[PDB]
C-alpha cells in the first residue's frame, strides 16, 4: 500500500521539475519584455 | 502604478 | 497513520493542479505583452 | 519506512511554497510590464 | 492577436 | 539584451 506511496511521490517529484523548468523558461521571456518595454520608452523620450 | 507615481523614468521598471 | 499521508498527498496533487492552472494563466497574459511590444515596436519604426 | 515518507513530504511542501512565492513575484513583475505597454501605447496614439 | 482582432483600443489588454 | 546584440529587427523577441 505505502509503495503505491513512493511512486505517486516520484510523480508529485517529476511534476514539480516541470513546474520549475516552466517557471525558468517564463522568467526569461518575461525578461525580454521587461528589456523590449525599456527599448521602447528609450525611443519615445 | 510605476511605483506608486514615483517617476523617475520608470524607476527601472519599478525596480524590476 | 499512512492514511493520513494519502490525504496530505491529496492536498498536495491540488495545489500543484492550482499551480498549473495559475502558470497557465501567466503565460497566456505573457503572450499579449509579447504581442502588444511588437505592436509598438513597429509602429515605432 | 514511512517516516521517511514524511519528510519527503515536508520537502515537497517547501518546494511548494518556494514554487507558489516565485510564482507572486512572476505576476507582479508581469503587471508592471502590462502597465508599461499600456503607458507607451497612451504616448503613441 | 489583441483578443481576436478586436480593436478597441487593444480592448484593455485583452482583458488583461 | 535582444539576443546578444543580435540585432535583427529584434530577432522576433528573442525567438520567443
Ligand atoms: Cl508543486
Known amino acids: ?3 503505491q506511496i513512493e511512486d505517486k ?3 508529485i517529484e517529476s511534476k ?10 517564463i522568467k526569461k521571456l518575461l525578461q525580454l ?4 518595454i525599456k527599448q ?3 525611443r519615445i523620450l | 502604478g510605476x511605483x506608486x507615481x514615483x517617476x523617475x523614468x520608470x524607476x527601472x521598471x519599478x525596480x524590476x
Open chain 1, 1 to 3: 500500500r505505502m509503495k
Open chain 1, 9 to 11: 511521490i516520484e510523480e
Open chain 1, 16 to 25: 514539480q521539475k516541470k513546474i520549475e523548468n516552466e517557471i525558468a523558461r
Open chain 1, 33 to 36: 519584455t521587461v528589456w523590449g
Open chain 1, 40 to 42: 521602447l520608452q528609450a
